[PDB]
């Protein structure tokens, strides 16, 4: 069990050498912006359906990354996402953690770009976009199975048709967490299992001239 230390924020995780790199490319170039931001915890219940967060809309009201994006015009960065779950050896279930570039929803501004809290899917069989859930694994994905492992890390590079873009209108990719196999337990245990997401930007550049 190791303990990472980036900036003025340290987390304690297992040094797990089973990371996935999205399409085999490392984030490269074309003070306190590289740290470990930790979002809120979502409570997995027996009837939950799914959650999603749009990037980089989730980090526009948080920290120095939130104020740098609201001043500069142009923007370009990679990311590094860490999702982990905390359950005892008497619960069962499985999660699917996959990214999806240019995620367009289907039927307001408080639903397409929800911010830092995230939103909840209504029809998780079709991902609220008409595409089926069963073929989601063509994307960079990782299986969280509560029997064996409690960790999943994806490295996401910059994917866009132009080398620089705005940070208040466009949203590159949306991360999806869907409970394929539902949660089950006997009575007398903890009914709600927490899920914790941790983001860390890699190779962030701003050339908006503010």
């Amino acid at each position: 069990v190791a303990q990472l230390t980036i900036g003025n924020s340290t987390i304690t995780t297992q040094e797990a050498a089973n990371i996935v790199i999205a399409y085999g490319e490392w984030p490269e170039y074309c003070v306190s912006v590289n740290r470990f931001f930790t979002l809120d915890t979502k409570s997995w219940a027996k009837d939950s359906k799914g959650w999603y967060w749009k990037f980089p809309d989730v980090l526009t009201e948080v920290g120095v990354f939130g104020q740098n994006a609201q001043f500069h015009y142009l923007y370009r960065s990679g990311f590094c996402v860490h999702v982990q779950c905390n359950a005892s050896k008497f619960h069962q279930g499985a999660l699917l953690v996959a990214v999806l570039p240019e995620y367009v929803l289907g039927t307001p501004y408080a639903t397409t770009q929800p911010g830092q809290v995230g939103a909840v899917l209504t029809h998780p069989y079709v991902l609220d976009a008409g595409i089926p859930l069963s073929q989601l694994t063509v994307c960079p994905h990782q299986w969280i199975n509560l029997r064996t492992n409690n960790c999943a890390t994806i490295i996401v590079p910059y994917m866009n048709t132009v080398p620089f873009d705005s940070a208040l209108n466009h949203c590159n990719f949306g991360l999806l967490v869907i409970p394929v196999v539902p949660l089950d337990f006997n009575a007398g245990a903890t009914s709600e299992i927490p899920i914790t997401v941790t983001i860390a930007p890699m190779c962030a550049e701003f050339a908006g001239l503010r």
């Binding site: 240019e102 976009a129 008409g130 595409i131 994917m159 048709t161 949203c171």
Partner: protein, 212 residues
């Protein structure tokens, strides 16, 4: 009805599933009538049909060229010696608003002049986007390629009804970032909306899990 015999043992070549071979064939993209105004406008639209919309939306970023071909006749087969004009308006130029407006004689809108008795005209159009590739999925808040305009040449009404069809081939294709295939019916041509009152399952159905 499936049957037993005639098994194959030799593997096939991998050129059959190259990305160029998947879009190599030329197919009909529009049908333009003109009965006895006098002008029509058909902007270049790939997702005009349910077919080839499901095939381009497998990927996210595509970059290609085009090649058009205009087969033109009467409503029933026959041909008469009629002169025609196909004007291609680039992205950023005003469209013709009348049969004899000023845009028909603008020097920077390239045209072709064919008769009906010739073999059909063939035009190639390069990659026109300011970005590096097209994209069928844009997440943010605000892919045009041009607009064809077709009229009969003259200052006098022609006594002939014209129906023409447009075919389109795709050359030098590159693709990026694949995506799951859509399995729900379409509603509009801009947004990926579905009907939420009923969801059609991907597979068919059987009775029990043991009855194979």
């Amino acid at each position: 009805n499936l049957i037993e015999t005639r098994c194959v043992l030799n593997h096939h070549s991998t050129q059959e599933t190259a990305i160029g071979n998947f879009f190599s064939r030329a197919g009909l993209v529009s049908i333009i009538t003109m009965p006895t105004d006098g002008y029509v406008n058909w902007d270049i639209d790939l997702m005009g049909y349910a077919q080839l919309r499901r095939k381009c939306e497998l990927f996210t970023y595509m970059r290609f060229d085009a090649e058009f071909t205009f087969v033109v006749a009467k409503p029933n087969g026959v041909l008469v010696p009629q002169l025609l004009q196909y004007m291609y308006v680039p992205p950023g130029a005003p469209k013709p608003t009348s049969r004899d407006s000023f845009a028909w004689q603008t020097a920077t809108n390239p045209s072709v002049f064919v008769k009906m008795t010739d073999p059909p005209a063939q035009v190639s159009v390069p990659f026109m986007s300011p970005a590096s590739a097209y994209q069928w999925f844009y997440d943010g808040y605000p892919n045009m390629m041009g607009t064809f305009s077709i009229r009969t040449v003259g200052t006098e009404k022609s006594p002939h009804s014209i129906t023409l069809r447009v075919y389109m081939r795709i050359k030098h294709v590159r693709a990026w970032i694949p995506r799951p295939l859509r399995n729900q019916p379409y509603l509009f041509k801009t947004n990926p909306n579905y009907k939420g009152n009923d969801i059609k399952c991907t597979s068919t159905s059987r009775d029990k899990i043991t009855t194979l």
